Write an enzyme that holds these catalytic residues in place. Structure first.
Site: not given
Ligand SMILES: CCOc1ccn(-c2ccc(F)cc2)c(=O)c1C(=O)Nc1ccc(Oc2ccnc(N)c2Cl)c(F)c1
Length: 278
Positions: A30-34, A37, A51, A141, A145-146, A159
């Site tokens: 799905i993701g994968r980046g800096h 992943c 993640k 941040d 995009r977030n 995030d």
């Molecule tokens: C290790 C800490 O991780 C955190 C920590 C805090 N917060 C946080 C920070 C501030 C806030 F207000 C609320 C949460 C986060 O959001 C994350 C995170 O990992 N977010 C994350 C986001 C998208 C991702 O991708 C997805 C996921 C689902 N569906 C699809 N389609 C995709 Cl593409 C993904 F995998 C991981």
């Protein structure tokens, strides 16, 4: 490793996902980046996002995860749990967001958003920020995009995780300090992104000196489909004095009024000068 920190290891315990109760489809990325992943995954059979850390650093990872445990709001991304894999990096498990991030979604030419839809998205982000601000949580941040988008078109502030200078408040660029008031500055930029359907802010401007640019007495231009009153709100979010910016409760209030005035008649089309712009 346990030799991480007892307090953290116990907190991660009340949200632990048994490595056998979750299947990760490392094939379906799905993701994968800096750094980390993202992969598709199944939980016991709920669809999810997994993640990982591609990598001290493990500690920050688990730590950022535990904080999410208290994020219970329809407009904030939730945590399903953290899986402690005995083979690799710990994993963070999130609910699946059918529509991905908000910026890619609005940028899609096959999508046909109205002024109302886009203002609605902003309204939802503001509600999420209002919740987060009430828990004394500074995002740092906030950007389109977030922000995630689920199957009912509910926006979830998140995030993904080298500063995002173009979303940063003046004082933060100058100090490196972040507050809830600097998140408001970022929120105004997020509003601009929505109304331009995902255009990049300050196209012409170099990251190395947005400060010099801003101090010349500049702000982002009013997007073509942005109502005056919403632009007036954006300018408030960008007040030079951080204490003069509206709170997220005020933003929710003001944006919800603007939103109520629309009926879904005004379609928003991308700007020709913003197209293909990186
Ligand atoms: C290790 C800490 O991780 C955190 C920590 C805090 N917060 C946080 C920070 C501030 C806030 F207000 C609320 C949460 C986060 O959001 C994350 C995170 O990992 N977010 C994350 C986001 C998208 C991702 O991708 C997805 C996921 C689902 N569906 C699809 N389609 C995709 Cl593409 C993904 F995998 C991981």
């Amino acid at each position: 490793l346990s030799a991480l920190n007892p307090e953290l290891v116990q907190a991660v315990q009340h949200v632990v996902i048994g490595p056998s109760s979750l299947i990760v489809h490392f094939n379906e990325v799905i993701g994968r980046g800096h750094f980390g992943c993202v992969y598709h995954g199944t939980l016991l059979k709920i669809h999810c996002a997994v993640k990982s850390l591609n990598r001290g650093e493990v500690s920050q990872f688990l730590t950022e995860g535990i904080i999410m445990k208290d994020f219970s709001h329809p407009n904030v991304l939730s945590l399903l749990g953290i899986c402690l894999r005995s083979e690799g990096s710990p994993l963070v498990v999130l609910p699946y967001m059918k529509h991905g991030d908000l910026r890619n979604f609005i940028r899609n030419e096959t999508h046909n958003p109205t002024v109302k839809d886009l203002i609605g998205f902003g309204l939802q982000v503001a509600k999420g920020m209002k919740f987060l601000a009430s828990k004394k949580f500074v995002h740092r941040d906030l950007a389109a995009r977030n922000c995630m988008l689920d199957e009912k078109f509910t926006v979830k502030v998140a995030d993904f995780g080298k500063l995002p200078v173009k979303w940063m408040a003046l004082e933060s660029l100058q100090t490196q300090k972040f507050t809830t008031k600097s998140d408001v500055w970022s929120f105004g930029v997020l509003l601009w992104e929505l109304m331009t359907r995902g255009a990049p802010p300050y196209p012409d401007v170099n990251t190395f000196d947005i400060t010099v640019y801003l101090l010349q007495g500049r702000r982002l231009l009013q997007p073509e489909y942005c109502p005056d009153p919403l632009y007036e709100v954006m300018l408030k979010c960008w007040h030079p004095k951080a204490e003069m910016r509206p709170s997220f409760s005020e933003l929710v209030s003001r944006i919800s009024a603007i939103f109520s005035t629309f009926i879904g008649e005004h379609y928003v089309h991308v700007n020709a000068t913003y197209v293909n712009v990186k």
